[model samples]
Target: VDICTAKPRDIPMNPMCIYRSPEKKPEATNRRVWELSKANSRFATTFYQHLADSKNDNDNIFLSPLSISTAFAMTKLGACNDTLQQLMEVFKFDTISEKTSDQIHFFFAKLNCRLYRKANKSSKLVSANRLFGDKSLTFNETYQDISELVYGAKLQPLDFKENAEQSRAAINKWVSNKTEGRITDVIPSEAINELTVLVLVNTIYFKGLWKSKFSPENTRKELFYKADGESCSASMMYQEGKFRYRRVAEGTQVLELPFKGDDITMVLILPKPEKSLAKVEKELTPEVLQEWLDELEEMMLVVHMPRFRIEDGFSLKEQLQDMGLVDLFSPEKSKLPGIVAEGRDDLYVSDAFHKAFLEVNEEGSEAAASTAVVIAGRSLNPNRVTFKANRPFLVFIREVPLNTIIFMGRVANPCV
Candidate 1:
C-alpha cells in the first residue's frame, strides 16, 4: 500500500519504490563484499585494456567480465541521479565499499547463491540473469522486486510495440536456452526497437574437468605463430602436470590450469621473445594483476596448449562510449528514472551485445558467455611458467574465492 504518496489516480503500477536497506554490521557486510570484489578487479582490468587496444595485434578476444558485469549490474537497477552517477563511474561502482541499492542487491543475491549451491556433479557452472520489458512500458514494481530479489533476475513482458520480430525471437530463445546450446542469435532483428525500454541479460555456462587431462594420443599438428610472423597448422594440446607457475619480471610466462572444481581456474600468459601481446597487454594494470597473483608457485611444467575454439562477438556501444560511459548512451543527457513511469527521460541506450563460446578439448573445458545490455541504448591477467601456448596467448577464467574474473581471452588463431 505504498506509491510515493499515491494520488496520481491511486496508482496500479509504477512509482512504488522500496529498497531502503541500511543498518549493516557483520564486519560491514564482509567489508562491503570485499570492496565489491576489488572494484570488480579494477573494472576487469580496464576492460581488458580496452579490448586489447581495439584489436588486431593478432585478434582473438573473448570476453565476459562475469558476463559484462552481470549485464551492467542489471542496468544498475533502473538508474537515477545522474544516471546513477554515470553507472557508478562506469561500473568500477564508484570505487566500491559504500554500497547500497540494497547493498548492491545483496551482493548479487549472495553471488547467485554461492554459484548455485556449490556446483559439483563433475562441474558445470551456470549463471543466468534476465529481464525483458516493454509490453507497453510502465514499470517499477520496486524495479521488479529488486530484479528477483537481488539479481536472480526475472521479468519478461515483451511485445516491443507490436511484436518487434516476436521480441527478437523470444530474446533469441532465451539465449539459446541459457547457453546449453552454446549461445546464438543474441538479440538480433535490428537489435529490437519501438524505442526498446529494457533488455539486460547475462548467461554463463561452463563445463570443467581436467585436473590434468589432455592426451587424446598427444594431440599433434603444431606450428602456430602468426602476428605477421606467419605460420599455421594447429591442434597442439599436451599435458604433464604439477601446475601453477610464474615468471614475470616483464618477460612473461605464468600458468595455472586446474578445473574439476578446484573452484575454477585457467590463467595462462606467455610473452617474451621480444615481447608482443602488446607487451603483456600494455602492462595489464590492477597492480600488475595483483603482482601476477602474488607470484604463483607450483612447478613441473611441459604443457603445450591449443586445441582451440572460440566464437566471439562484441558490440559494447562504442567501447562503452570510449570508456567514460558518456551519459549512458545519451538521449539528451540520459537518466533511467527507475525504469519507467512516464518514459524517464525517454530511455537511452541502443546497443551492447556480447557472445562468447570456448573449448579447449582433450576431456575438459567448455565455455559459454552471453551478455546483452541493449537499452536500445546502453552499456585480467595472470601467469605461470613454461606455458607453451604456441604463439599468441593470454586467457583467464578465474573464480578462486572471490578473485573472480570469469573469462577473458586471446589465443590468436586457435583454429578460429
Candidate 2:
C-alpha cells in the first residue's frame, strides 16, 4: 500500500512519494538505495578507522555505526546549505542523482522497512530514531512527516523549555523501551536543558542465538595476549564445525558464523601475527573488506573465541567533527533551519549521544554495537583449521541480505 507497491504516476508526489526499489525487482529509483548502501559501508569503515586510531584504541570499542549514521541522516532532513553539504562529504555521497532526486528520503525508508522486517523470533534487530523538540519551538509539519516516513521516528514534542529533567527522563525511557531495557539512561540530565532546541537519539538492539550453540562444557579459561604484550585469563569459548573461513595472503584468518535465521552473520578477522591487529586496522577499507568477505568459503575447522561483554557510551560529537562535520556542532555556523516552521537560525545540534551493549557467551549473543576456521589432522586431531582470537581482533555483525554492517568493533581485551 506504500510507495514500494504503488504506481509512480498514480498519486501526486509530495511526502508520500518514494523511489521504487532495485533489489526487490529493479526500478530506476532503486539505484538510489543501492548507492546509499555503498555510501553506508564507506562511512562504516571510515568510522571504524577513527575508533581504531582514537585515544581509547588500547581498550575494547563497540558501537553501532548504522545507528549513528541513521540518526545523522534523520537530522539531515532538517539541514540545508553547508550543513547538508558537509554531511554529503562526510558520508561519501558526493552528489544526489538528478532523476527522481526529490525522492531521496525513501532510500532510508525502504532500508528501514527492509531491515526491520528481519526481526522475528530467533533473530531480532531493532533500530529506532526519534526527535524531541521543546514545546515552545514550532517544528515544520513537512519535516516531521518525512522524518517519520523515512526513519520510523516522528517528532515527540517535549517541555524542554520548562520541564527539562522530565524531558530527559522521557527520552531515556523511550530508549530503554526500544532496547528491551538492555540500555538505560541513554542521555544524562544536563544534556537536556531549557535551551535545548531539539534532541535526536537512535538505539539498535539485536539478540540472536547461534545456529549451532556452544556447549558449556567446552568453555574454559585461556590466556589472551594484549596488544601491549601483557597476558590475562579469558573465558574462551570453543566449537568445532563446518564454517566459512579463509586466510588472506596478508596472513589474516577470516571466519563467518551465522545466527539462527541466517540473515545475519558474525564475521571475525584475526591477524596471524597477533601483534599486527593495528596494521590490519590501518589497511582496512571497503574494497579490501569486501574482497575478504567474498573470499570466505565453507570448510570444517576449530574455533577459539573469547566470551565477553562490553558496555560503551560516548558523545559522537568529537568523532563527527574529526570526520570534518564541524558545522553541525557550531551553533553560529550550523544551518538546521529546515525543521522549524518559521526557520529559526539558532537551531543547531548541541550533542550527539550513543550507548551500546553487547554480550557473547556459549548460548549466543545479545548485542546493542554488536564472530570460525578449518584445520587439518596435522596435530593428530581430525580438525584441520583453527582460528585463535587470543588477542585484539576485528568483529563485524552484518545483515547479509541488505549488505550492511550493523555493528563493528574491536575486542582488545575481552576480560576488561
Candidate 3:
C-alpha cells in the first residue's frame, strides 16, 4: 500500500504546529540555577516596586536587578555573620535554597556560563563584572581567585588616594565602553574619595532583533493614553502575527514579544486604563507573573506597540538602606572579613548607583545597564485576540533559557 503525500483533515491544528518535547528531571546544577533564578526574579519585582513607590506616576523606570545582585554577590565574599545575613536576606538566597549561602557563587558561575554560551548575532548579550579596589588595600589571594572564577569579577587597583578624579574617569570609561556609551560616569566624582577601599561594578548590554519585525511603514501617529489623565500622539508600531497572548479576567492583558533566535523576549504586561495601572502595579510580584505566564495561548492577532525608548539613572544606596540593608552600609558595624586580608571591617558600601538605557523600535531593541556599588566601609495564545498596548504598561526583557530578568521598566507615556 502506498501512503498519500498529503491528506486533508476536517480541522487543521494551525499555521504552525508544536508538539510535546519530552520532560525529564533537571540536572543538579540546573535545579540550583532554577532556585537562584526564581529568587533573583523575586528580587527584581520587589526591587522595582520599591523604586516605583518613590517616583511620580508619570515617570518611566528601568534597571537590572541581576546586575546589582552580582555586584553584591561579590561583596558577599568578605561579609561575615550579621552583615552576611542581611545581604543574603536582601537577595533571598538563604530562604530560596536549602543549601548553604556559600553555593550562591557556584550557581552564579553556572548561570553566567549557561546564559552567555548561546550568544550570537540574533541576541548580542554582554555582562561585565569588575572590582576596583584602592591600591592601599590588600584583598586576600583566595578571595581574589574565587571572585574571578566563581563570580566572574576580576579585581583591579585604583589610586583613590592621590588621583580620585583620574580613578573615577578610568572607571567611567570602562563603564561607558562596556555599555556602548549608553552609561557614563557611573561613579560620580565625589562618590570615590580617599576613603573608598573597593567598588564592585557590573554592566550588561543587549542588542536583540525581533523574531517578527514591525514594519516602519506600518508605524504611524496614534493616541497613547497616559496614567495622569493625559493623551498624546505617539509612534506606535503595528504587526499581525501569531503570538502568545493572554488577558486576565480582572485586570490587564499580557503579550510576549520575542526577540530574534527565541533566546530572549520582552514580556509586556499592559494594564487597560490609567486607574488599573496603579492597581496592577500594586499587585505586581513574581508569583502573579508566573501565573500569567502559565495562562498564555497562541493565536493570530493584531499587535499595536509603541516605538518607545526609556533611559534613567539613580543612586540605589538609600533605597537599599530603606529596604532593610541597614547593616551592610554601616561603616562601623559592617564586617567583611574576606574582602581585605586584615581590614575587612574597614569596608562598607558608601553608595549604590545604577544607570540603564532601553530603546524599542521597528527592527528590535538595544538595552544597556551599568550597576556600581561604591564601597566605603561597609507565553502565546492563538486566535484573533487583539493586543493593543496603547496605555501605560510594564516591560520585562527576560533570558528565556534561564528565567533571568535582564531588564524591567514601564512606558507610562511613550511619547514623552
Candidate 4:
C-alpha cells in the first residue's frame, strides 16, 4: 500500500526508502544506515569517475563531491573518516557551508532513493527465477513475485540477456530508447555488454544551450595548453555576458554560469598564474565553495566564459576507502538484504563504476553518466581519469538535487 501525498511537499524526502526495511534492528541501525548512506555517496563519487573512464579515457576522469559521498554510503554502514579527509583535501569540501551542506544532504537523499528503488527492483527480478529447497515456480509466478515491489515491474526477460552479446544489445536498446536515438549506442565493447548478474548500472544525461547561442561564425581557432607545455589550436566557444563571478585569494577566480530556468548552476574554479592545482585545491573546502558563491552574488559584472564540451570519468573504490568506507566491500560482514534470494550471499558489491558525458549547446546543457558493479570477475579495474588538469577548469551540467555532476574538466588540449 502506498501513502497518498496530500501536497507536493509530502513527497518522501528519501527515495532509497525501500532499503529502510524495518525488518532488522530498526531503532539502533537507522543511524548506522544514514552513516552507510553518506558513505555510499562518498564511495560512488570516488570510484564512479574512474569507471566512466574504464575504456578510452581510463586515466582521465575528475573527481566530484557527489560521487565521493555516494561511494562512501554504498560501501559500509560506517563512515570512512580517512577517505573523507582525502576528499576534503582534493575537493576542498570544508569550504562549503552548513546551508549548502544541508542542500547537498537533501539532494543525496533523493539520489539514494532512486538508487535503492532500482536496486531493489533488480534484485527481486533476479530472485524470482531462483529456487530453494525443492520449491519452484514458473517464470510467470517469479515475475509476479518480483513485480510486487517494482511499481511497474513489467516483465521483459527478452530485455534481460543471459550472455554478454545479448546483454549489450539490451543495454544499447535501453539507452537508445531513453535518449530517443540521440544516443543510439552505449558500450564500445562487444565482449562484455550486459551488466553482469551482480551488476547495477546508473546513468544520467543532460543537454543545455547557452542563454545566448554562440554564433558558429564567431567560432575561432584559439590556443589551448597542451600537457607537453605547448599550445595547440582548437575551435573554442566564446561568449560575453553579465556573469556571477568572484576572485579568491592568491589570484584564483571562480565563476557561476546559470542555465535556463535557473534550477541548476555550473561552477568553475580557475587558478592563478603561479598557483598550481595542488595549492589551489588546498585552499578550497565546502566552506570555501559557499563563500565563493556568496561573494560572487554580491557583485555582478560582464564576464567571459569559454564555451566547451567535456567528457570526464573516474572510479570511487580508492576514493571511497580514502574517504572512510571499507566494510561494504567485505563480502563477509556486509548485509545487502534483498540482493540475494536465499540469503546465501552470491553477491557483494565488488565494483562500483561510473561514466559521465556532457555537451553544452545554444539551447542548454546535455549530458549522460552511468554507474555499475561487477562481482566474481575481480576484473575490478581501478582505472582513473586522464585529465590531469593543471589549471583553468570548469564544471557544468549538474542537477542540484543529486549534486549529480554531468560535465566538468580542464582543457589541457582542446585541439584534436
Candidate 5:
C-alpha cells in the first residue's frame, strides 16, 4: 500500500529495523550480518576498542545509544524496505553492524518522516511536528541525493529539474536548523548543477562531563596503548562518582550512566580485572547485550569517568546499499510512494541520505539533560568499591523512547 494509504500504526516496526533498515532482511545471507549487527551493537566497547586502536588505519566509525536515537524520527516511520535493508548491511559491515546500521538507519528514518509527513500535511504529535514549515527536496533532486548515499556516488541529469532546485533549497534550510548550524551548507547549490532528488542529514551534538568531574589540577599525562600495542603518552583526566554496573558474564563488568535531563544514557563494558580483552571480545554478542542489562541490579558503585568530548560526520549513500538498501536507491525501479506526483498511483521512494555529529562531557549543554552517574555496588557502601574509568573507553548516548542512538564515539585520549 502507498504511504498515504498506510496509517502510522500499519508500518511494521521491525524489532531490529533500527538494527537493520525499516524492512532490512534482504536475503538469508544477510541474516549473518543480522546476528553480527546485534552482537556488535550491544558490545559497544569492542567497536570503540578498534576505533581507538590508532592502528586499524581504516576509516573508523562508532555509535552511542544517543546518536542512534537522533535517527529515530525515521525508524518510527517504518520504512524497512529491501533497498534500505541492503544499504544497512554495506555501511555498518559485520564488524560494527548493529550500531553503525542503527545509527545510520535512525538518521534516514527521521529525515524521511520529516519530508513525508510534511508532504502529506499530516500534523505531528505535540512533541514532534516542527514549528517551521515542511522542507522539500522534489523527486529528481532527492533521487540525486539518495543515489550518492546508496552508491557512495552521485548522478546528474535527472527527469525533474525546476522542482528539484526549489526543493533542494528548502532541504538545505531544514538541515541548517536540524544540525543547530553545525552542518550548514551540507549540500552546496554548486553541487545541485542538475535537478536534485533527495537530502538526508543527522546532526548530533553531545556535551557531557566525566561522571566524576575531573580536577583540572589532577589531570596528568599518561601512557596509552595504541592499536598496535605501542605505548603513547596523552593527558588523562580523572574523577570518581556513582555509576551503574552489571556483570555481563563470568568475567565481564558493564557500567551505565545517564546524560543530563535523562534523555539518553551511556553504557560501558570492562573486562573483569582478571579477564583478557581478546577473551571478552570473542564472547561479545547481542545475547551478551541483553544479558548485560538483565544482570544489572541498580546498585551503587563509585565511577571515575573522564572529562572528554568527541565529534564525527559521514555519508551513508554507498555504504547503505552494501548493507541491503539497493532497491530504494535504484533508478530503474524504486517504490517511493510519498515522493511521486502522478497522484500516488506511481509513488516510489525518490531519495534517502543523512549526516550527523555528537559530543559528550561531565556537565550538560543548554536545554539538555544533566549528567547523572550511577555506579553498581552495594547501595549501603557507596564508596566501598569503585568504577573508576581511567583507561580509554567507549561512549554512547541512546534516546530511550525512540530506542535509537544519535551519537557514538571513543575517548581514546580524553585529556588530549
Candidate 6:
C-alpha cells in the first residue's frame, strides 16, 4: 500500500545512451507541420508493430510512441549527415519528399500548442521535454536554443561526476512530476553514473472524462477472457450509447469513444468471436488504421469493458535496432557532432528506456509515459456495436483533427 516504498529497478544505465546525428539547420515553414504528422503516424505504426512483435503473443502491452519519438526527435536536433538520415528514416520521413529538419520542429511546436488547449479545464494533458547535461561537458548554444525554441526543452546542469545518485533522483523527480507520478523512476539509479554525459527526457500525461461517462454503480465483477482462453475476474464497466463503429473485412470491429473536449478519442479494435487477435495485429497497417477511422459509422450498442490498470517498462535499444535504426547506437558510425563540442565518436546512444502507465474504469482514462535516452535515448471507440472488451484488443488514443496517435497498446489480459 506504500507507494514510496516501491524501489527503482536497477537497469545499469551507462554512457552511450546518447543520440547520434550531424549538425543543425535553419527553421522550416509551417507548411510542413501537417505533412510531418503523416510521417509521424507512419513511424507510430511501424514502432507499434515492432513493440507488438517483441512481446509474447498473449502478453498485454502499452506504449506512448509520441513520448518515445518526441525524445528521439529532440535528439535528432543535433544529428547530421547519415546519422540524421537514419533518424529521419526511422521516423518514416522520406529523404527527398519529406519536409526539412526545420519543418519537423515547427510541426512539434504546433502540436505542443494544441495539447495545451484545455490544460486548465477538467481534461488534463501535458507533454514536456528536458535535457540533463553533465556540467563537465560543453554543448553548442544553438543546439540548446533550438530544442528550447521548438520542443520547449529545458536545460539543467547537473554534476554527474560529483553526485550521480542525487543527479539521477533529480532527473527521476522531473519525470515523475511531469507524468503526474504515474512514472516515478524513469532513470533508474543503475542507468546513470559518472560517465553519463547527457540525458534526453520526454514525458506525456493525459486524463480525460468520457463524453458519455460510464456509471461507477454499474461496474461489477465479470469474466475477462485472456488470449489463451483462460479467464480471470475483472471489474467490468458497462455502457450503451451511439458511437462511431466499423466492422472490418478482416473479422474485427473498430469502435471510437470520444473524450469530453472532442479533441481526443479512444479507439478499440476487437477480433471476431473465434478469430485470434494475432491475425488482426498482423494485418494492422497505417492504411488499415486510417481506413477504420475513415469508414466508421455511428451506431447504438451495448459495451462491456474491464476496468484495468497497467504499469510497465522496458529498454528499447534492441527493439529499435530490429526496426532498421542502427547507426545511431553505433559509436564508430554514429554522428552526433552537435551535442558535445569535442568528439563525435565519443558519444552515442547507449540505451533507450520507456515506461508507461494506464488505468481505465467507469470514470474515464488516465495514462502517462516517460522516455529517457541515456545519451541514451532514444527512442477509441468505440463503437460499440456490442464491443465487449472482455477479451484481447488493441487501443489507440488519437487526436481527432490531425488523427495523430498519441498512445497505443494491446490488452491481452486485463487482470495482469
Alpha-carbon RMSD to native, per candidate: 19.4, 5.1, 14.0, 13.9, 10.6, 11.5
- Which residue ranges in model 5 land beyond 4 Å of their true spot? 1-174, 188-191, 202-218, 272-284, 298-302, 343-354, 364-392, 400-406, 413-415
Please write out the lDDT profile of model 1 over residues 1-416, one tens digit for every residue: 23222332443223222233323332333455556666677788888888889888777888778778778867767766665666667667666434444355455555555555554456778888888988777787777876765566788889888877888889889888988888989877777877776787888888786777775667788888878898788988776657878888766888888787787788888887667888778888888877887789888767888787788887888877788777778888766777666656557777788988887777653433222121233111134335667788888887776667878888888864
Candidate 2 C-alpha error for residue 55, in Å: 3.1
Model 3 misplaced regions, further than 4 Å: 1-29, 118-121, 365-383
Select the stronger candidate by lDDT from 1 and 4.
Answer: 1
Higher TM-score: candidate 3 or 4?
3
lDDT of 5 by residue, 70-168 (tens): 232232222334433443443343234334343433234333232223222221111111211113333333323332332122222222254555655
Between candidates 1 and 2, the lDDT winner: 2
* Model 3 per-residue lDDT tens digits across residues 260-304: 878788999987663457678789877988889779888678899
Comparing 1 with 4 on TM-score, the higher-scoring candidate is: 4
TM-score of 4: 0.58
At residue 360, candidate 1 shows an lDDT of: 77
Per-candidate TM vs. native?
0.33, 0.89, 0.87, 0.58, 0.55, 0.86
Model 4, range 1-416, lDDT digits (tens) per residue? 33121222442222211211112212232342243333343333333343333423212334344433433322211112333233332333333322121223333444444333333221110111111111121232422332222222233343223465665666657655544454544454432433334333333334343443454444456665543456656655444435666777877777666655444567767676566544444445434554665687433333333444455544445554554445555566444433334434423455554444444433333332132223353332234111122334535444343333444444433454
lDDT of each: 0.72, 0.77, 0.77, 0.40, 0.42, 0.76
Candidate 6 minimal-lDDT segment of 10 residues: 2-11
Residue-pair clashes per prediction, in order, are: 11, 8, 19, 83, 91, 30
**Where does the lowest 10-residue lDDT sum fall in candidate 1?**
372-381
The global Cα lDDT (0 to 1) of model 4 is 0.40
**Model 6 per-residue lDDT tens digits across residues 238-339:** 767778888887568898988887778899999986888877887888888887789998888777878888777889898888877788899888777777
lDDT of candidate model 3 versus the reference: 0.77
Higher TM-score: candidate 1 or 5? 5
Model 5 residue 39 CA deviation in Å: 13
